[PDB]
Amino acid sequence: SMEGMLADFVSQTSPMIPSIVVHCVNEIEQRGLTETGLYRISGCDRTVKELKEKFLRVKTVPLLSKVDDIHAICSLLKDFLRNLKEPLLTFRLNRAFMEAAEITDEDNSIAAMYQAVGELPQANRDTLAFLMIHLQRVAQSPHTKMDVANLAKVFGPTIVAHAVPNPDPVTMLQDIKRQPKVVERLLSLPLEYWSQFMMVE
Q1: Long-range contacts of 135-138 (CB under 8 A, 24+ apart)
Q2: Could you please report the per-residue DSSP string of 117-137?
Q3: Sign for the pseudo-dihedral over CA of 181, 187, 190, 194
Q4: C-alpha to C-alpha distance for 92 and 173, rounded to whole angstroms
Q5: Whole-number Å distance between alpha carbons of 96 and 116
Q6: What is the dihedral sign for C-alpha 167, 168, 169, 171?
Q7: Which secondary structure element, helix H or strand E, spans residue 23, and what is its range?
Q8: Rounded to 5 degrees, what are φ and ψ at 101?
Q9: 3-class SS at 168?
Q10: Does the domain at residues 1-201 carry the CATH identifier 1.10.555.10?
């Protein structure tokens, strides 16, 4: 992808979250939480490509309020994050996140997760935090038929991904087995924890 690194999509001001991410989550919060299958049904490919062109080639905010296919907005959000030059959780911390999630006791695992989040670059942390607040709500909504594991299944490849740019296919498969637990543990961290990165408390 020619998207390049998350930091090219944020400003100097906090919280450092890309426009595309804010706008996509806005629409899903406004009219997605009554729809089943969010983030698991693919949007129309052509629609997703057209929206991608507006944000990344034309450099405008397309009128997402007019996009009838809510799943195309879910797909657009995932596509943008997946095609970053390194994953949201970073190459540096990929194994640290997996290993933190894989600690068997919940309490020590959670402590290790906070340590890993605390080591992220600021844009990555802020963007992650905003996304987690949203995805918790998707899991909480009784209408989406999506639980935290359903979201973790597809956000694993999206935001955890790999420790290197071009893993061998066996490492790829091992990573893929490990990514969802990372997202489940992140989604289990409190709303009040993620919220602190949106403001000055």
Answers
A1: 135/187, 136/187, 136/191, 136/194, 137/29, 137/33, 138/28, 138/32, 138/33, 138/38, 138/39
A2: HTTS-HHHHHHHHHHHHHHHH
A3: positive
A4: 19
A5: 7
A6: negative
A7: helix 19-31
A8: -70, -30
A9: coil
A10: yes
DSSP 164: S
Phi, psi of 5, deg, nearest 5: -95, 155
Rounded to a whole number, what is the distance in angstroms from the first to the last CA of the chain?
37
Residue among 126, 138, 20 nearest 81 (CA): 20
DSSP line for 50-91: HHHHIIIII-S---GGG---HHHHHHHHHHHHHTSSS-TT-S
Structure method: X-ray
Distance CA 48, CA 94 (A): 28
CA distance 188 to 101: 11
Q: What is the DSSP letter of 180?
A: H
List the chain domain ranges. Answer: 1-201
Which distant-in-sequence residues (6+ apart) come within 8 Å of 120 by Cβ?
Answer: 89, 90, 93, 128
Q: How many whole angstroms separate alpha carbon 13 and alpha carbon 111?
A: 28
Distance CA 5, CA 199 (A): 24
Distance (Å, rounded) from C-alpha 150 to C-alpha 191?
19
